[PDB]
Amino acid sequence: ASGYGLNGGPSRCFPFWQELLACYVTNSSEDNPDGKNKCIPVMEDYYECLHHRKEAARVRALQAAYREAEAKKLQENPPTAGQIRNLGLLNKEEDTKKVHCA
């Protein structure tokens, strides 16, 4: 919310806070009681940026699907780390073709 981050630049969740301040100030007044009800989803995104609960929930099911989807399929030839570490290198074209199965 402050606007100042660790590296001298701005804070990561400051855009969401201004998107939430702008919503409340330009949609809610004393004339209209429920205008602040457009700030609900905007406030959720701000709380998500700071804490990352819904993304954690999403990436915790998707990772449970993939890990048992790639646990039962047949494995032909797993590329070794040394092969991956030569990927995209100008004299190791053989390893890159193996990695990308082209």
Partner: protein, 167 residues
């Protein structure tokens, strides 16, 4: 992924999935870190408009600029590929002399002036491009043109002359 500096990273996660065919492909820049610094002032002499347009498109569309600004980024990597291509076509010897200097000098520009001045000579003759640093003070010699560099580790020999465009 997040822009946070990592403290306990022990593994790398690579995704071999290719970009979709909908998005026009672009050959990527292949110059390493020191070749880029040697050609940095040349690139912004030519691609400044494309470099500034790309940064403006992103500013114009907040939170959505990695997407929706993809054509502009391809324009910048083509402008810079033409500078890197042009320098190799005419100044290859002077270019490699300067960037190999910067390799052993902490990539600090004031540490390789004799090599830079020769490259600036060849690029201005061959490509009519000129190193310009904007908003420099007016009451003194430009730092990139001074016969003496105070913070240089090795002294600049007096016969090594700074390249003034026209003398």
């Amino acid at each position: 992924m997040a822009t946070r500096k990592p403290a306990f990273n022990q593994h790398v996660l690579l995704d071999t999935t290719p970009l979709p065919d909908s998005i026009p492909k672009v050959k990527e820049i292949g110059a390493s870190s020191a070749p880029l610094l040697s050609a940095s002032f040349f690139i912004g002499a030519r691609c400044k408009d494309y470099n500034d347009d790309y940064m403006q498109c992103k500013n114009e569309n907040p939170g959505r600029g990695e997407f929706e600004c993809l054509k502009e980024g391809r324009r910048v990597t083509r402008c810079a590929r033409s500078v890197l291509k042009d320098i190799n076509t005419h100044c290859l010897e002077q270019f490699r002399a300067h960037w190999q200097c910067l390799d052993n000098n902490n990539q600090q520009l004031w540490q390789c002036r004799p090599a830079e001045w020769k490259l600036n000579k060849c690029v201005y003759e061959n490509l009519k491009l000129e190193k310009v640093i904007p908003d420099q003070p007016k009451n003194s010699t430009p730092v990139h043109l001074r016969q003496r560099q105070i913070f240089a580790h090795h002294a600049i020999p007096p016969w090594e002359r700074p390249f003034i465009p026209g003398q």
